[PDB]
């Protein structure tokens, strides 16, 4: 049963070309209704006269208007219906831009995402077909390594689903996605590719993203540094004490100085242990 | 007065009390004024000033009630606590703060904390990678088995290379940062 | 309440008769009706027009506005429909809209307003129903 | 009685009179005066006495009316009790055989959230438990819910009384008529019951079920209510690139712009969007779906393009629709905007083809030539199209018609070097019949640059050179122009060299050549002859002369950024330019204090005197745009009283009829001639009353033009930039420093602020603060700034002028 109502109709082969009460000229293939073309006004199918190379329509007038039937579209789609997807692809060089994407979508609806991918002019339709197929690599080329982050975020999730972490780390990189990218990445235990995607985070006040990156194998890679950058100077002093290479003396000073400028006088800090905070000789391991 | 003198004398308004505290740099009074101002913002800002006087116990309390468990989680190895660092992890687990709950597992020598939190997130992949690298392949495997398997894959980061960190060599922590106060 | 007030206005610069379902818009009713209905509710010959953050629905009758006001809304069809039913009920009481005759049948109109819209929720009315009350 | 606040003595008289009509009218008159908001308690005993038990509905209905709008306030005839004179004999009213009195009584009684009527409203649901109408059953579900709202969120209101206590809401679902006052907080069982009811609906009732519980699995099931929710639900299940093709949204949408052209213009926009989603470059913005109405098959009958032609407009429908339509042609089809703008421009620009597209007003013609021509400058393909169309523009062969044509094309040649060689011969033709400047200017430039190509030039130029018309600006343009390109490549009776001779004479020299030039004395004072006179180093030859200049284009010239361009189609642009896009002794002491962001005017009121000042009241006043947010409220100012009394302050209000000075503060006391005295607390200014508003560069510019701002002062302490003192002070005279009017460099760089306000004074206020901060060896006056000021009759101009100097107040009591 076909969606678009048949106001009048005609049989061209076993395919039914009909007019619709939407002014749509549609054709029935497969029990599926496709729109061959749009009628602008209300039109009736007089008949198909092979001579003129036309379908002859008439309005309210007992005169002629002509629509040539779009046979290349019809044959592509008919072949798709039959489940002769390859056959429909032979038709494709003579299906233009957006029409290849549409005919592709027909091919797809009937099934076979991949054959639809080759014919679809539009890269986006290829890109989605590639996610659907589960062809990560093909979807990856289609995104294209530099930008198209939206493509990559869809790919990155798809890659995590398949538990193919590898493709996922690359998608997230291209995506950028510092917050998400870090989560996959900081699971390293050696911080192998986690610093880059959090370099910014250090100084953006995305300190949290930054600390996980650098402290992951007993190393202070830029742990301290993230804390200085942000102005969370106390925290760098504190870190320095923790792992004691006694760097604390310098950090506490820089910090103490910062208290005097940032209006503290009764906790002013400019001493070694007298005015609140405590430089390294107060401190210990 | 930026070195309170006049300030000490009139302090009756919960705001004047708040103000007084940052101008000294001793935020012990701040928290109470901040309390009596009935407001969260004050607790996080005085907590930050607190970290500045040096002591993180006071920061924790504030930051906990402003609900910045994740800031705390970040602070905590920096501070060198491990007991307090665990408390933050749970109460940030539930928020699904992935830059809160997530932190602490790294910060202790073993990663197990993440593995469960991530399991609850449904982030099975992330949970396996974290666990596996520490040599907690068994937990990593649990996550794979409950969810989609395939743990074999080697990402741009390691999926099984040692994670071990010696957590905080300091015996007295920086929640216990020394102070005299003037 | 969703419906603040149901109000008959004269664009003389005053609310001629009006109904406050529960004590809220007393004096408030007159100032809103007086300013906004004068400009055609600030309309352009559109039934919905919103001004000073209050939805005004209206119909002009002479120098008078029959006005429904809301500042919240549950459905599109409903606001018009209470106004509409009101517009069947109002000429039975006052023979179109006109300030003096509206004034004289404050009781009639006001009672209909309570009956039509109860605690801001648009009930329904009809000219026969109205009769039992004023009997 | 429309609104008559003193009439309460007559109403009492009218309220009982032995004539039922009079009583009804009286009670009615009370209602209308309360609703407006006027005096009512005097009457109460009289009002209450006739009506109370009766089943006679009209008085009862009237009294029932007055109990929902003021019952609480009025107390002469009612007082305070559980079974007040609102409901005591209205238990009879509730229990009458006539549904109307019971129903009415139920309805007001339960409507109140009153606690002095809580008990009488509860079994008041009895009056409507039996349902003689749809109205009775609806009245009941709404009244039970209103009872639930009135302090009975527990067991006093939730079960059944005998059929409803919060259960009409359940019953309604399965009964013939629906209505669910159950929207929040009510029985779960009824909520569930409404779902079942979606099927067995009553349509008004369906809108009530539906506000509570929405989203269907179906298509529908029937009725406007379900239908209205349904389009919301559809937008969910396909959000993607707008609705595209509007759903059931279309019906309300037309009325949304009933005034009348704006609907079509909007409709045209959607229809264009819908056609296709193109590239989406500069004015190629069509979104929605890529294919849904395609574009451009060659077998499609009678094609998509027929609708596309409407959008190409001269005005072909009316102006609002026109502006939308030109953008819309550009939007579906072009390369950017350029392609379809050239087609569109070809139609609009002046020709010999149609005289419905040519006009003898020179600027419009000229502008139209520039619009067509800017497309070439934008995109190459257009150069080839433009030049032959431009020659058709010329063919009109009015002095002026040629003139406009010549003027743009000459600019195009500056861009388009020795590409437009072909045009020169066409361009000369109409240069001979002449009555204007423009024709001479342009022609002399084409014929001049183009000399290598042609050889005619003594003959063409010479008829004009000895002809008259208007010739100021002619001089300038001919001066840089006449010799150019190839040193000896012409000859008719004057080769290119005669032309250089001529070119020099026309500029400012003298020489017999082309039967002498028309004028020699140059255009506007700065231009003069001399530069070019020096020039022509190598006689009219592409080298480093006039030719160079001519066959080169000044700065960058690309796009439609207005660099040898004009930005789309000239008529559409006028509309876009228009769019501004604007966004008893008394003593007082006082200070202003702020604690926990509460701004208050502290006042201390002092009686230094032994004398009696009892009868002491304190008030802060509303002057105009100043207002009290709460006056000081103590009854202080007594024999030797010192008190601190706080008056809260606002700055923003609406003008009151009393004086408009500083701040009025009123203390009252003993005295009978001057029972009220006005005495002051510290300064507040007239300036408060101004209201701040802002301008953009377009609004500022428009207003500059609109009314004069010649008036200037120089204000000291404008040494500083815009941001510092000047902004803060300007703020207090409710002004704001917005956009610039500056032109900074190494010699220029006064800071310029465009100011705006819209004063509550019947004027706007504008100003430009120019800060004369030295960026030259000779400053105006060094640091300081001159503020050029206005207001709409420059009555606030002056406020800007002095309130940008200094401004500070403090005290320390």
Swiss-Prot record, chain A:
This is Coatomer subunit beta'. The modification N6-acetyllysine is found at residue 109. Oligomeric complex that consists of at least the alpha, beta, beta', gamma, delta, epsilon and zeta subunits. Probably interacts with PEX11A. Interacts with SCYL1. Interacts with JAGN1. Belongs to the WD repeat COPB2 family. The coatomer is a cytosolic protein complex that binds to dilysine motifs and reversibly associates with Golgi non-clathrin-coated vesicles, which further mediate biosynthetic protein transport from the ER, via the Golgi up to the trans Golgi network. Coatomer complex is required for budding from Golgi membranes, and is essential for the retrograde Golgi-to-ER transport of dilysine-tagged proteins. This coatomer complex protein, essential for Golgi budding and vesicular trafficking, is a selective binding protein (RACK) for protein kinase C, epsilon type. It binds to Golgi membranes in a GTP-dependent manner. It comes from the Eukaryota. It comes from Mus musculus. Disruption phenotype: The knockout of the gene results in early embryonic lethality with no viable embryos recovered at 12.5 dpc. WD repeats lie at residues 228-265. It is found in: Cytoplasm, Cytosol; Golgi apparatus membrane; Cytoplasmic vesicle, COPI-coated vesicle membrane.
Curated annotation (Swiss-Prot), chain B:
It is found in: Cytoplasm; Golgi apparatus membrane; Cytoplasmic vesicle, COPI-coated vesicle membrane. Oligomeric complex that consists of at least the alpha, beta, beta', gamma, delta, epsilon and zeta subunits. Interacts with SCYL1. Interacts with JAGN1. Interacts with TMEM41B. Interacts with SVEP1. Probably interacts with PEX11A. The coatomer is a cytosolic protein complex that binds to dilysine motifs and reversibly associates with Golgi non-clathrin-coated vesicles, which further mediate biosynthetic protein transport from the ER, via the Golgi up to the trans Golgi network. Coatomer complex is required for budding from Golgi membranes, and is essential for the retrograde Golgi-to-ER transport of dilysine-tagged proteins. This is Coatomer subunit alpha. It comes from Mus musculus (Mouse).
UniProtKB/Swiss-Prot annotation, chain C:
This is Coatomer subunit delta. Oligomeric complex that consists of at least the alpha, beta, beta', gamma, delta, epsilon and zeta subunits. Belongs to the adaptor complexes medium subunit family. Delta-COP subfamily. It comes from the Eukaryota. It is found in: Cytoplasm; Golgi apparatus membrane; Cytoplasmic vesicle, COPI-coated vesicle membrane. The coatomer is a cytosolic protein complex that binds to dilysine motifs and reversibly associates with Golgi non-clathrin-coated vesicles, which further mediate biosynthetic protein transport from the ER, via the Golgi up to the trans Golgi network. Coatomer complex is required for budding from Golgi membranes, and is essential for the retrograde Golgi-to-ER transport of dilysine-tagged proteins. The chain holds residues 1 to 135 of 511 of the full protein. Transmembrane segments: none annotated.
UniProtKB/Swiss-Prot annotation, chain D:
It is a peripheral membrane protein. HEAT repeats lie at residues 81-116, 117-153, 225-261, 262-299, 301-338, 381-418. The modification N6-acetyllysine is found at residue 479. Proteolytically cleaved between Ser-513 and Ser-514 by CAPN8. The keyword Ribonucleoprotein does not apply. Gene3D superfamilies: Leucine-rich Repeat Variant. One of its GO terms (molecular function) is structural molecule activity. Pfam families: Adaptin_N, Coatamer_beta_C, Coatomer_b_Cpla. Oligomeric complex that consists of at least the alpha, beta, beta', gamma, delta, epsilon and zeta subunits. Interacts with CAPN8. Interacts with SCYL1 and PRKCE. Interacts with COPG1. Interacts with ARF1 (myristoylated); this interaction is required for binding of COPB1 to Golgi membranes. Interacts (via trunk domain) with ARF1 (via switch I region); the interaction is direct. Interacts with KCNK2 (via N-terminus); this interaction increases the channel-mediated whole cell currents and promotes plasma membrane expression of KCNK2. Interacts with STX17. Interacts with TMEM115. This is Coatomer subunit beta. It comes from Mus musculus (Mouse).
């Amino acid at each position: 049963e076909i969606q678009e109502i048949v106001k009048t109709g005609l049989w061209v082969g076993d395919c039914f070309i009909y007019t619709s009460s939407v002014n749509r000229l549609n054709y029935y293939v497969g029990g599926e209704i496709v729109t061959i073309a749009h009628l602008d006004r209300t039109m009736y199918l007089l008949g198909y006269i092979p001579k003129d190379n036309r379908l002859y329509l008439g309005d309210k007038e007992l005169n002629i208007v002509s629509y040539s039937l779009l046979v290349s579209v019809l044959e592509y789609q008919t072949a798709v219906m039959r489940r002769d997807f390859s056959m429909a692809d032979k038709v494709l060089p003579t299906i233009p831009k957006e029409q290849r994407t549409r005919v592709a979508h027909f091919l797809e609806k009937q099934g076979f995402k991949q054959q639809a991918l080759t014919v679809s002019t539009d890269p986006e339709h290829r890109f989605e077909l590639a996610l659907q197929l589960g062809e990560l690599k093909i979807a990856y080329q289609l995104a294209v390594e530099a930008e198209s982050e939206q493509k990559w975020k869809q790919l990155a999730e798809l890659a995590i689903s398949k538990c193919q972490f590898s493709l996922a780390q690359e998608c997230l990189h291209h995506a950028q996605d510092y917050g998400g990218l870090l989560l996959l990445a900081t699971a390293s235990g050696n911080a192998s590719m986690v610093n880059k995607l959090a370099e910014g985070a250090e100084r953006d006040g995305k300190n949290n993203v930054a600390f996980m990156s650098y402290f992951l194998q007993g190393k202070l890679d830029a742990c301290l540094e993230l804390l200085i950058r942000t102005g969370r100077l106390p925290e760098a002093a504190f870190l320095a004490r923790t792992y004691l290479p006694s760097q604390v003396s310098r950090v506490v000073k820089l910090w103490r100085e910062n208290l005097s400028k940032v209006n503290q006088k009764a906790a002013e800090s400019l001493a070694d242990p007298t005015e609140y905070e405590n430089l390294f000789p107060g401190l210990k391991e | 007065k930026g070195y309170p003198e006049v300030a000490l004398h009139f302090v009756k308004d919960e705001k004047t009390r708040f103000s007084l505290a940052l101008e000294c740099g001793n935020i012990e009074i701040a928290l109470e004024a901040a309390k009596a101002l009935d407001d969260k913002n004050c607790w996080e800002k005085l907590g930050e000033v607190a970290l500045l006087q040096g002591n993180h116990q006071i920061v924790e309390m504030c930051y906990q009630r402003t609900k910045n468990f994740d800031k705390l989680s970040f602070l905590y190895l920096i501070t060198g606590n491990l007991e307090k660092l665990r408390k933050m992890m749970k109460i940030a687990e539930i928020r699904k703060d992935m830059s809160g709950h997530y932190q602490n597992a790294l910060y202790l020598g073993d990663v197990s904390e993440r593995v469960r939190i991530l399991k609850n997130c449904g982030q099975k992949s992330l949970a396996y990678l974290s666990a596996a690298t520490h040599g907690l392949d068994e937990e990593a495997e649990s996550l794979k088995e409950t969810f989609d398997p395939e743990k074999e894959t080697i990402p741009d980061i390691d999926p099984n290379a040692k994670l071990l960190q010696p957590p905080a060599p300091i015996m007295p922590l920086d929640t216990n940062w020394p102070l005299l106060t003037v | 309440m969703v419906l603040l007030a149901a109000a008959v206005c004269t664009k003389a610069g005053k609310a001629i008769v009006s109904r406050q379902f529960v004590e809220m818009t007393r004096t408030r009713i007159e100032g809103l009706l007086a300013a906004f209905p004068k400009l055609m509710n600030t309309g352009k010959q559109h039934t919905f027009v919103e001004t000073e953050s209050v939805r005004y629905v209206y119909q002009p009758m002479e120098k008078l506005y029959m006005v429904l006001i809301t500042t919240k809304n549950s459905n599109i069809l409903e606001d018009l429909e209470t106004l509409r039913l009101f517009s069947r009920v109002i000429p039975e009481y006052c023979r179109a809209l006109e300030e003096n005759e509206i004034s004289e049948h404050c009781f009639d109109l006001i009672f209909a307003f309570d009956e039509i819209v109860a605690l801001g929720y648009r009930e329904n009315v009809n000219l026969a129903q109205i009769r039992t009350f004023t009997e | 009685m429309d609104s008559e606040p003193p009439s309460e003595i007559s109403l009492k008289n009218d309220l009982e009179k032995g004539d039922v009509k009079s009583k009804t009218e009286a009670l009615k008159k009370v209602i209308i005066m309360i609703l407006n908001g006027e005096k009512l308690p005097g009457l109460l005993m009289t009002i209450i006495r006739f009506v109370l038990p009766l089943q006679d509905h009209t008085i009862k209905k009237l009294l029932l009316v007055f109990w929902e709008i003021v019952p609480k306030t009025t107390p002469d005839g009612r007082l305070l009790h559980e079974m007040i004179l609102v409901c005591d004999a209205y238990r009879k009213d509730l229990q009458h055989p006539n549904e109307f009195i019971r129903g009415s009584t139920l309805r007001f009684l339960c409507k109140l959230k009153e606690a002095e009527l809580l008990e009488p409203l509860m079994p008041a649901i009895r009056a409507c438990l039996e349902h003689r109408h749809s109205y009775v059953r609806r009245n009941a579900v709404l009244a039970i819910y209103t009872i639930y709202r009135n302090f009975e969120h527990l067991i006093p209101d939730a079960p059944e009384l005998i059929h409803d206590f919060l259960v009409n809401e359940k019953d309604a679902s399965c009964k013939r008529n629906a209505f669910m006052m159950l929207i929040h907080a009510d029985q779960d069982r009824a909520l569930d019951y409404l779902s079942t009811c979606i099927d067995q609906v009553q349509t008004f009732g369906d809108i009530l079920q539906l506000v509570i519980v929405e989203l269907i699995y179906k298509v529908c099931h029937a009725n406007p209510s379900e239908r209205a929710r349904f389009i919301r639900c559809i937008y969910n299940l396909l959000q993607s690139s707008s609705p595209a093709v509007k759903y059931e949204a279309a019906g309300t949408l037309v009325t949304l712009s009933s005034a009348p052209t704006a609907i079509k213009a909007a409709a045209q926009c959607y229809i264009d969007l819908i056609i296709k989603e193109s590239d989406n470059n500069v004015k190629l913005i069509v979104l929605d779906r890529l294919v849904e109405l395609k574009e451009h098959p060659a077998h499609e009958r009678v094609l998509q393009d027929l609708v596309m032609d409407i959008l190409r407009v001269l005005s072909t429908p009316d102006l609002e629709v026109r502006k939308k339509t030109l953008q819309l042609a550009l939007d579906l089809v072009s390369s950017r905007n350029v392609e379809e703008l050239v087609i569109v421009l070809k139609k609009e620009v002046i020709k010999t083809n149609n005289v419905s597209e040519h006009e003898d007003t020179d600027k419009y013609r000229q502008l139209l030539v520039r619009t067509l021509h800017s497309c070439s400058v934008r995109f190459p393909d257009m150069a080839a199209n433009v030049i032959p169309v431009l020659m058709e523009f010329l063919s009109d062969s009015n002095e002026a018609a040629a003139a406009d044509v010549l003027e743009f094309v000459r600019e195009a040649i500056q861009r388009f070097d020795n590409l437009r060689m072909l045009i020169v011969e066409k361009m000369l033709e109409v240069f001979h019949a002449i009555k204007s400047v423009k024709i001479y200017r342009g022609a002399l430039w084409i014929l001049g640059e183009y000399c290598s190509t042609k050889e005619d030039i003594q003959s063409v130029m010479t008829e004009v050179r000895r002809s008259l018309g208007e010739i100021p600006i002619v001089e300038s343009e001919i001066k840089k122009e006449a010799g150019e390109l190839k040193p000896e490549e012409e000859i008719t009776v004057g080769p290119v060299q005669k032309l250089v001779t001529e070119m020099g004479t026309y500029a400012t020299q003298s020489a017999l050549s082309s039967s002498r030039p028309t004028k020699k004395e140059e255009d506007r004072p700065p231009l003069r002859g001399f530069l070019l006179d020096g020039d022509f180093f190598v006689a009219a030859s592409l080298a480093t002369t006039l030719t160079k200049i001519a066959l080169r284009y000044v700065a960058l010239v690309q796009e439609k950024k207005k660099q040898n361009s004009f930005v789309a189609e000239a008529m559409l642009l006028m509309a876009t330019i228009l769019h501004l896009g604007k966004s008893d002794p008394v003593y007082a002491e006082a200070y202003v204090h702020v604690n926990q962001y509460d701004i208050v005017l502290d006042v201390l009121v002092v009686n230094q005197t032994s004398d009696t000042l009892q009868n002491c009241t304190l008030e802060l006043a509303t002057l105009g745009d100043l207002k009290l947010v709460e006056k000081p409220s103590p009854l202080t100012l007594a024999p030797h009283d010192f008190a601190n009394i706080k008056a809260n302050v606002k700055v923003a209000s609406t003008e009151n009829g009393i004086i408009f000075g500083n701040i009025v503060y009123d203390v009252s006391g003993a005295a009978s001639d001057r029972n009220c005295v006005v005495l002051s607390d510290i300064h507040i200014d007239i300036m408060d009353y101004i209201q701040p508003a802002t301008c953009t560069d377009a609004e500022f510019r428009q207003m500059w033009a609109e009314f004069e701002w010649e008036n200037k002062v120089t204000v000291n302490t404008n040494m500083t930039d815009l941001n510092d003192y000047l902004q803060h002070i300007l703020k207090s005279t409710n002004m704001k420093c917005l956009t610039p009017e500056k032109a900074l460099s190494g010699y220029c760089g006064f800071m310029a602020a465009n100011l705006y306000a819209r004063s509550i004074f019947g004027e706007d206020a504008l100003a430009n603060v120019s800060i004369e901060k030295p960026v030259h060896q000779g400053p105006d006056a060094a640091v300081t700034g001159h503020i050029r000021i206005r207001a709409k009759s420059q009555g606030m101009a002056l406020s800007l002028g002095d309130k940008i100097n200094l401004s500070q107040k403090k005290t320390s009591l």
